[PDB]
């Protein structure tokens, strides 16, 4: 970020990135030019000696498509909140759901992981999420160093119209009903973490009636975690079991799921870092004789070549391990290998 | 505002805010995540010793729906202008409509009241408005202290197509002919100011054929205002007359409506800020039978606390006092009370 | 632009500007209010002695509709490079088509002109473009001042569905197939010239009525005068199944000539005077040779500092009514514009 203003107990980052960013794939609807940035702004506000107020908003632009395109920008991250010392702080507005606290350990590939994957974005408490209430704690309440915790509320977001309508609707796939989440992070050692995740919220009449596949009053979530970053040595891997709450593509959502991720890398001191990944996500008790299947299942290659702290270019290779069958074919799940080349300017 | 440039003669603001925002309601269309952020731009150039010119833009971005829906920002405003010292100012782009010189004294809930209550925007020269050409005095070119007046014309924003389209085309609920409006303001003492804003409107062929209510060539609109703003206490009210310009929900538009808004607050050494308000909007001569009908009634009780200059939070209770009848349930209005909880970081 | 930022070898500058903005024509899809903005910023980070990265955005916001209008802003541009020495600079992202390098002479009048006219974007290489890695080499290799040359890569961007389909498609007005280009310019008189090849995609062959081809060319060759308060301009360029025929398809040929001529006086007055023509050949459907654009523009600016301008431009449409221009949406009518603008 640039800091663009500080004066008088007010501070004011400027950040964001351009990404020139192209895929190579068979699958068309994938392949092609992926350029896109992200702006966004940080603000904090020292109030007195043990409160500080706080802004975020991050916005992300596509760039690929005409001028003519609809629905080529949107926002990530909007919330503001306060900072209470010791004691903590609580947000609320668009924000990461508290699971992310810890499989956010994971995301950290070239240019493939993250939301999208295992869990997508508006996705009950998975990721980025409307509505979300977040009280936090560092270092719990300054007695134990290393050691974090968050608890979260979530309102329902509905449906567009008719009884399970919320202002702010939205299709079945990306709906909610009051929810929470809880998470919590540890320096078990020198540079290696452990953290614990979990979820419950409550489903909508839309997500019980108009896909075919998940049935259940509740989504639920359970996140473990580990994580090394020391000695140029970055490891982390991190286990979820869902019900009612992994996606089993445009079909629904799967009755249970069971979604793994693991990643080494290493960072060189000239600046290059490559990357080494693999991701499953397996879907279980799916209506329609579907039985157990895989939703996503890849090993990934990269590596990022960091010119600086304000500009990189990188290349990711997802090897897809997914076969075609008619699960695959009829949810519109991606089984063909892709290759990005990256060449990023961030300030 | 955040001064981010100020050099040669050339400065630029920056501001906004974030705004963490729920909305509790039995009506569906307005309960739940309520989360949007502002952000503009305003920047004014010293030209010569007796003229400067201007740019503003406003631009608000809703947070509360996904990453994949549509229609989510929006431009509040965009103009430029050049100032005269004594002669007045000329600024053209979307503004504010002048009547709202004098509505304006009332729109200062913690969060409800302003447009889309008693008058909307794009909504004749009743607030926000695209293709304004303002003309501007202060103090009465100098002779006068406390003095303000306003000249305002605005060209046809017609139909999408047919006879009646410009290039920026809309539907009839936000169509508007060629018209002008006037507004003068007189500040007696500092804090205690009377008003008076009058506009005048060609009617569209759409606003007569489409909608069932509401038939006649001519919108126009009367409004008077009185502010009592000093030692702590601000007090407010405007009584406006409206022909043909006072939209009756989806039904079209009122033939005549009266529209009356009220507000007292209060506010005290360590930040609280109390409000109470009184708003309504009643139709006359309404078709099909409706005679005369209530648009819009209701009281506000609420409050502001102010962190400081940069954040705040609030509390407002909309309690509504309007009938669910086949007037309200036919025109698409809401009956139900709303309670707001809003926590605002501003830059 | 105002550098908000410069700090340890990183620079940001913020531009844009706020354009109030009303047309006046009978021709009710021109007339009315087009005010708009325009918001960007412009990065470089210094690598080392020899290497230097940037980032550009460019961002487009309307300003003329309510709001609770759609798809009232977009990306212009939005590319990130290297630039090493003498050797050159490369950028990958939305960025301008390098015939643009040598269209851009005569893309200077006070309002019209530009893209829209003979040529659009999302137009192949002709102006701004998805997908484009650019090359470019000022002073050859810093051996012969004034001498420019481009060379420039974009790939596919194909239709929505289907197997013609790319993750970026659009209609087939907006797409194209793997295309390359080059551009040389020699500079206070100038001569440039610009060549570009695509192929076309499968849409664009079935689903407009007119033009046909596997490939899409252009030929361009420029002029410029500038020096001694006086700026003159000249481009033209022939194509072959590149030019809009309005929505009804490609001109299988066209022609197109822009030149124009202003002049700068002290106090801040620039009048303008300009012709601009697109003439296509050889149309389906009993076309056949149609004057696709056609018209004579006066206007001037006048600049009160470097960030406050006003205007007007009057746009003489010489184009006739016929079945071409009403099916094709071509719109034959006069336009008068006035503007006032705020630069940052
Ligand atoms: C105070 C100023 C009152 C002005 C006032 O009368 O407010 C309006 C009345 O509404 C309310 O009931 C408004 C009620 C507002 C409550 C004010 C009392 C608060 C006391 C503390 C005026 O309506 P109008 O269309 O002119 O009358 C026509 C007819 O006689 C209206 O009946
Ligand atoms: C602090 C500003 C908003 C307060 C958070 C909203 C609380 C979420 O409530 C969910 C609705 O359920 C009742
Ligand atoms: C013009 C394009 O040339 C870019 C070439 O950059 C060479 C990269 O060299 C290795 C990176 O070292 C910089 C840190
Ligand atoms: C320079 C800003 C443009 C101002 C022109 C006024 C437009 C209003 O006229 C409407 C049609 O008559
Ligand atoms: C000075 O000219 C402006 C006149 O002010 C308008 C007053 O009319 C409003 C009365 O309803
Ligand atoms: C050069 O002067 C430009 C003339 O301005 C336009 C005049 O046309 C207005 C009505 O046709
Ligand atoms: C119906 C499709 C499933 C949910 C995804 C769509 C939600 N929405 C409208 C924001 O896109
Ligand atoms: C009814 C008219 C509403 C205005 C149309 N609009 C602006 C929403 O497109
Ligand atoms: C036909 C071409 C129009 C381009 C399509 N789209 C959606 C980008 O506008």
Redesign the pocket.
């Known amino acids: 970020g640039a800091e663009i203003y500080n004066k008088d107990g007010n501070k004011l980052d400027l950040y964001g990135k351009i990404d020139g960013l192209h895929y190579f794939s068979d699958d068309k609807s994938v392949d092609g030019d992926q350029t896109y940035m992200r702006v966004g702004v940080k603000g904090e506000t020292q109030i007195n000696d043990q409160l500080t107020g706080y802004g975020q908003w991050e916005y992300n632009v596509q760039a690929n498509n005409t001028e003519s395109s609809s629905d080529q920008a949107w926002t990530r991250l909007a919330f503001a909140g306060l900072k209470f010392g010791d004691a903590g702080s609580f947000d609320y507005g668009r924000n990461y759901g508290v699971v992310y606290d810890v499989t956010s350990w994971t995301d950290v590939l070239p240019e493939f992981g993250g939301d999208g994957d295992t869990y997508g974005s508006?996705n009950f408490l998975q990721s980025r999420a409307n509505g979300v209430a977040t009280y936090r704690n560092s270092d719990f309440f300054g007695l134990v160093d290393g050691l974090n915790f968050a608890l979260q509320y979530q309102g329902k977001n509905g449906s567009?119209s008719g009884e399970g309508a919320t202002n702010n609707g939205?299709?079945?796939?990306?709906?909610n009903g009051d929810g929470f989440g809880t998470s919590l992070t540890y320096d078990i050692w020198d540079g290696i973490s452990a953290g614990f995740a979990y979820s419950h919220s409550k489903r909508t009449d839309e997500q019980n009636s108009?896909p075919a596949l998940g049935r259940g009053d509740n989504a639920e979530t359970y996140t473990g975690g580990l994580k090394y970053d020391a000695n140029n040595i970055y490891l982390a891997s991190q286990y979820t079991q869902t019900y009612n709450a992994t996606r089993a593509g445009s079909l629904g959502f799967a009755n249970k799921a069971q979604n793994f991720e693991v990643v080494a890398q290493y960072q060189f001191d000239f600046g290059l870092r490559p990357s080494v990944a693999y991701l499953q996500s397996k879907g279980k008790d799916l209506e329609r004789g579907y039985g157990d299947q895989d939703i996503l299942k890849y090993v990934d290659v990269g590596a990022t070549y960091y010119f600086n702290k304000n500009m990189s270019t990188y290349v990711d290779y997802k090897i897809n391990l997914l076969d075609d069958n008619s699960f695959t074919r009829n949810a519109g799940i991606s089984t063909d290998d892709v290759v990005a080349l990256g060449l990023v300017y961030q300030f």
């Open positions: 508006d567009v939205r299709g079945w796939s990306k709906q108009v």
